[PDB]
């Protein structure tokens, strides 16, 4: 419980790369997270939007 | 069908060319939504309801 000022450096670091990281799962909008998806389901004219 | 009574037909365990489909000029209309018809060839699916 002493090292607290340390150990939250290492918290704040694996919070904000654990959100960044998730981030790739949300759809903001499109059809899918994920790029793969979108490249094998759409002809690009379709799949640039 | 009458458009009511809607007939639904289970398609599975199977192979498709969806070629055969969309080159038929027959079709007086053909659209497709979060599928490209030229890029169905590559897919699978869980079923498909026809």
């Not at chain 1, 150990?7 to 793969?36: C, E, P, R």
């Not at chain 2, 007939?7 to 000029?25: E, F, G, M, P």
């Amino acid at each position: 419980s002493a090292l607290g000022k340390l150990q939250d450096v290492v918290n704040q670091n694996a919070q904000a790369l654990n959100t960044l990281v998730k981030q790739l799962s949300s759809n903001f909008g499109a059809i899918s997270s994920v790029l793969n998806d979108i490249l094998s389901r759409l002809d690009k004219v379709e799949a640039e939007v | 069908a009458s458009v009511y009574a809607w007939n639904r037909k289970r398609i599975s365990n199977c192979v498709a060319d969806y070629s055969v489909l969309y080159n038929s000029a027959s079709f007086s209309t053909f659209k497709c939504y979060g599928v490209s018809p030229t890029k169905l060839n590559d897919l699978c699916f869980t079923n498909v309801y026809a």
